């Protein structure tokens, strides 16, 4: 029988699914959540051998260990040990679309273990084995004997070993098939691995046992009174003396208790459930669970005799909370949610898809440190500890079924097929059975990117019927099917419609009010953070805040799915698709995080943290109004710091504690403003600070900030008239200027400033030429490659117009002498195939002070694609330690990604001005800059800029950061104007009309001087 | 102080170029000790007889955003026709220019003034590259209006019938203009993308006798 090729067989002899057990035998250990003797982890050094196909596996592996087998760590993906390649594929299957068959070359992992078991486990009780995650299907042997079969890579498989166990040495044998009929429901946009990648364990239950328990909490109108209902189910021999007690703890205090005999109410004509009982505990004035305040109670479920003997106990965390959709709103505890969320894949750059507590906690802190409150299990149920961490630190969780059929044509070919409903239903139902007791799970998701079929309809209704306490969502088939309670599109832009046939992605604002529509909107994915991205993020959050039925979204996504590779000198580097010999591959598309794989943030993270603040600020005269957006908590851990500065120079500051109620306003009056002496701009800043450490943040955490322009004093005083005069020395080839030890050389053929001098030290390498192009970002490229060109792409537009290779064709180069200065006047035109793309007109001016005032005016042919940048570049000779700039930062910012940045004097090392995206591009831009010191140099004006050892050439030519090499001296780009980075999605132009450079005529002036 | 602000000369110089003459001026507008505007211009007069005017304005961030950034003068001439290659034929402004079309437009002088019963700024036309009036021609990228009434007369007059045509012709050429609003007419209604908030502004004009 080929079960890995049959969707009518998803398991054999697999025991039923259930909430997480521990079979505690001591109620205090249960209550306190301490370890239980009755649950052994079998994680450790296992034996493993790899095979090309299940048919190549010898029959001697079932009885004895293969000598050629290696001793490896479990849990793990055998790819991370390098037995075969990991495959990154986005949409297209890693196998031939041939339901139900998989390839006859099917990578097969033969795991096994020799173990020892307690005498009392052999004496009595049920001993089961629990593989938390096996990817993708497997057969199980114990002591040579066949036990059962399992599918679905992201939920636990459990089998009874009691009848298989022997005295002394026992032997497991787990045959892991990488591909199965199960692979057809597991087509997520991620790395394709396999193995026993989650916990393996042994649970020892009494024969008369708790087999299930359900914890429900309903409320009255003000949540001042709550009932806790606990349905308890058992297996084994019922006896008149058995009892169940459900107790509820808050700290070290019982709050209420329920004790009763098995025997449920009459259900139907035939009676009730004799093997069940339902306990009701009344709880007055309960502490409610929210992400804002993760108030947890503890529930202990004791199976015991009326005479007072405990048989076993199971337990969970309880958060009193109600989630309903009323009058078009997602309410939590009767308050409307604002989902500040992100999609999170289970990923590690060393371990693949194996998860650990240290990583999770790192992820959970960071997210909450960067103003996130919700997360989507994109796109499968997670390692079980995740929900517990979420319950305790406080995050709203979308628990998502392990069904994805992105590769089907059309996407619903399987989800509309009733032959596939059983395989689908297992994947949905078994998530609930497992996860229904976690307070942190607020929404059930029916899977991802699988179109819309009757199967989705069928399972939605199953969930509604089985768990009325939670809304069900699903993006498939239009994001507003009969199969979702929430309009939950992916990448639906804010203002712009995208009227795709059958599945249009409307503008979110317009979507809400489509005729007859009432449901709320929360994007299941938005703001593709791929490479230099998240441009246009502030536009979402403004709309989220204005429209009450817009209730947020989950960013795509948390972490970069890069995997560590090592080089010839044994040095690590981050690798993406096709870097493993895997093909077809979707290259750098596995990498869309706000953080790098090692959990270093991309600079897009600070934008998100800023936009997702919980306090809103207004300024009206000298009056700051602070608004809390919190639904539940007061600001019991906040003080507002305020700061006024005249162009980076502190003028005054202070502290006022925030005592803001949830959704209230504090009016903080600033003292009589100290009116400044000199000339510049006053900028107000406010940072909100948490003085006390929490479980999620250090003492001093800055949770919110905002700046404002106050009074500006325009500079009027004339230059202190110097008594030096710059001398023009005109030759045949170069207009040359002197002034003391300063020397300027303008070339007559090129028409550009070719070299500067300080004494005998030349200042340049590459001349100060114009630039109208950038090394393309992932958003610029999109889906386009050399073999299939996407003609629509921003980059392919610039390539096909000539933007990238067009050459300066000097129209004029003159040099008149001024009274107190020297004045050079250039003109250039850039051409390609007889078309004039850009005319550039400049006027350099050098006075007796050393200051060189460059004035630039550019013309842009209205019918060429709008250019990426309008500015200048030169390769400076000196290599420096510091960069110093008055303007936005300190971090990298772009026209549509600069809200998070702050105007001030910033001093960073040169390498912080370079952003090491795994796919190299335009990076380290800092906008709205007025002054820029590096070495002895200084550029004043109103511009944006980037300064690195990498040319735009090297960046656009190299595909991996690790293969870049510092160049001689330092490349400087100085931009009058830069186009948006975009990123509403990464497969179509997404730079908004107001951040495209479209004016036609552009002006900007620079001042260059040695300090 | 926008209506009573007095230009105070900071700089006025001239330079003898190889094939042109260059006027360089700088100004600062003040009121109660606070600089409202600054305007650094170059006036370039070369052998073609063409005068190249370039204006680089600075608006103080904390001052309310001005209604226009541009130039005005009273012309000695009074002519019969106005001819222009810009948006037209009728009155149009930055936030009310969609009905207008870009083409060659020739109208009598009186059709360049809109007889609004309460008199105000009027008759402007936007995105003009070329404008002719008698001997004169201006080029660049600007908005303009033209009439026998000064801006001064218009605001000081309560009804149109009380307007007297002044001597010569009044020209207001702007590089930038604030939109007009009208969502209501009892509170600021000019959208943000039509307010002049940039802080630094640039427009340039060529004046010559055709
Ligand atoms: Mg099967
Ligand atoms: Mg997909
Ligand atoms: Na809202
Ligand atoms: Na991806």
Coordinates of N, CA, C and O in Angstrom, one line a residue, chain A residues 715-721 818-821 845 847 851 853 1005, chain B residues 7-15 22-29 37-43 54 56 58:
Chain A
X715 N 17.8 83.3 8.2 CA 19.1 84.0 8.3 C 19.2 85.1 7.3 O 18.9 84.9 6.1
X716 N 19.6 86.3 7.7 CA 19.6 87.4 6.8 C 20.9 88.2 6.7 O 21.2 88.7 5.6
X717 N 21.8 88.1 7.7 CA 23.0 88.8 7.7 C 24.0 88.4 6.6 O 24.1 87.2 6.3
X718 N 24.6 89.4 5.9 CA 25.4 89.1 4.8 C 26.8 88.5 5.2 O 27.3 88.8 6.3
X719 N 27.4 87.6 4.3 CA 28.7 87.1 4.6 C 29.7 88.2 5.0 O 29.7 89.3 4.4
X720 N 30.4 88.0 6.1 CA 31.4 88.9 6.5 C 32.5 89.1 5.4 O 33.2 88.2 5.2
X721 N 32.4 90.2 4.7 CA 33.2 90.4 3.5 C 34.7 90.1 3.6 O 35.4 90.9 4.2
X818 N 33.9 87.0 -12.0 CA 33.0 88.0 -11.3 C 33.9 89.0 -10.5 O 35.1 88.8 -10.4
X819 N 33.2 90.0 -9.9 CA 33.9 91.0 -9.1 C 34.7 90.3 -7.9 O 35.9 90.4 -7.8
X820 N 33.9 89.7 -7.1 CA 34.4 89.1 -5.8 C 34.5 87.5 -5.9 O 34.9 86.9 -4.9
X821 N 34.3 86.9 -7.0 CA 34.2 85.5 -7.2 C 34.6 85.0 -8.5 O 35.2 85.7 -9.3
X845 N 29.8 78.6 -8.3 CA 30.3 79.9 -7.9 C 31.3 79.8 -6.8 O 31.0 79.2 -5.8
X847 N 33.5 82.1 -4.2 CA 33.9 83.4 -3.7 C 35.2 83.3 -2.9 O 35.7 82.2 -2.7
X851 N 33.9 79.0 -0.2 CA 32.6 78.4 -0.4 C 32.3 78.2 -1.9 O 32.4 79.2 -2.7
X853 N 29.3 77.5 -4.3 CA 27.8 77.4 -4.4 C 27.4 76.8 -5.8 O 27.4 77.5 -6.8
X1005 N 20.1 73.8 -4.9 CA 21.4 74.4 -4.8 C 22.2 73.8 -3.6 O 21.7 73.5 -2.5
Chain B
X7 N 9.8 95.3 2.0 CA 11.0 94.8 1.5 C 12.2 95.7 2.0 O 12.2 96.9 1.8
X8 N 13.2 95.0 2.6 CA 14.4 95.7 3.0 C 15.6 95.1 2.2 O 15.9 94.0 2.4
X9 N 16.2 95.9 1.3 CA 17.3 95.5 0.5 C 18.4 95.0 1.4 O 18.9 95.6 2.3
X10 N 18.8 93.7 1.1 CA 20.0 93.1 1.7 C 21.2 93.3 0.8 O 22.3 93.6 1.2
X11 N 20.9 93.0 -0.5 CA 22.0 92.9 -1.5 C 21.4 93.4 -2.9 O 20.3 93.1 -3.2
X12 N 22.2 94.2 -3.6 CA 22.0 94.6 -5.0 C 23.3 94.9 -5.7 O 24.0 95.9 -5.4
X13 N 23.7 93.9 -6.6 CA 25.0 94.0 -7.3 C 24.8 93.8 -8.8 O 23.9 93.2 -9.2
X14 N 25.8 94.2 -9.5 CA 25.9 94.0 -11.0 C 27.3 93.5 -11.4 O 28.3 93.9 -10.7
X15 N 27.4 92.6 -12.4 CA 28.6 92.0 -12.8 C 28.7 92.0 -14.3 O 27.7 91.7 -15.0
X22 N 24.8 90.9 -15.4 CA 24.2 90.2 -14.4 C 23.8 91.0 -13.2 O 24.7 91.6 -12.5
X23 N 22.5 91.2 -12.9 CA 22.0 91.8 -11.7 C 21.8 90.7 -10.7 O 21.2 89.7 -11.0
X24 N 22.3 90.9 -9.5 CA 22.0 90.0 -8.3 C 21.4 90.8 -7.2 O 22.0 91.8 -6.7
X25 N 20.2 90.5 -6.8 CA 19.6 91.1 -5.7 C 19.2 90.1 -4.6 O 18.9 89.0 -4.9
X26 N 19.2 90.6 -3.3 CA 18.6 89.8 -2.2 C 17.7 90.7 -1.4 O 18.1 91.9 -1.0
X27 N 16.6 90.2 -1.0 CA 15.6 90.9 -0.2 C 15.1 90.1 1.1 O 15.3 88.9 1.1
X28 N 14.6 90.8 2.0 CA 14.0 90.2 3.2 C 12.8 91.0 3.6 O 12.8 92.2 3.8
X29 N 11.6 90.3 3.7 CA 10.4 90.9 4.2 C 10.3 90.7 5.7 O 10.3 89.5 6.2
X37 N 9.6 86.7 4.6 CA 10.1 86.1 3.3 C 11.5 86.6 3.0 O 12.0 87.5 3.6
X38 N 12.2 85.9 2.1 CA 13.5 86.2 1.5 C 13.4 85.9 0.0 O 12.9 84.8 -0.4
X39 N 14.0 86.8 -0.9 CA 13.9 86.5 -2.3 C 15.3 86.8 -2.9 O 15.7 88.0 -3.1
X40 N 16.0 85.8 -3.3 CA 17.3 85.9 -4.0 C 17.1 85.7 -5.5 O 16.9 84.6 -6.0
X41 N 17.2 86.8 -6.3 CA 17.0 86.8 -7.7 C 18.3 87.1 -8.5 O 19.2 87.7 -8.0
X42 N 18.3 86.5 -9.7 CA 19.3 87.0 -10.7 C 18.5 87.5 -11.9 O 17.5 86.9 -12.4
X43 N 19.0 88.7 -12.4 CA 18.5 89.3 -13.6 C 19.6 89.2 -14.7 O 20.6 89.9 -14.5
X54 N 15.4 84.9 -12.5 CA 15.4 83.6 -11.7 C 15.0 84.0 -10.3 O 15.7 84.8 -9.7
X56 N 14.4 82.6 -6.3 CA 14.5 81.6 -5.3 C 14.0 82.2 -3.9 O 14.7 83.0 -3.3
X58 N 12.2 82.0 0.0 CA 12.2 81.3 1.3 C 11.1 81.8 2.1 O 11.0 82.9 2.5

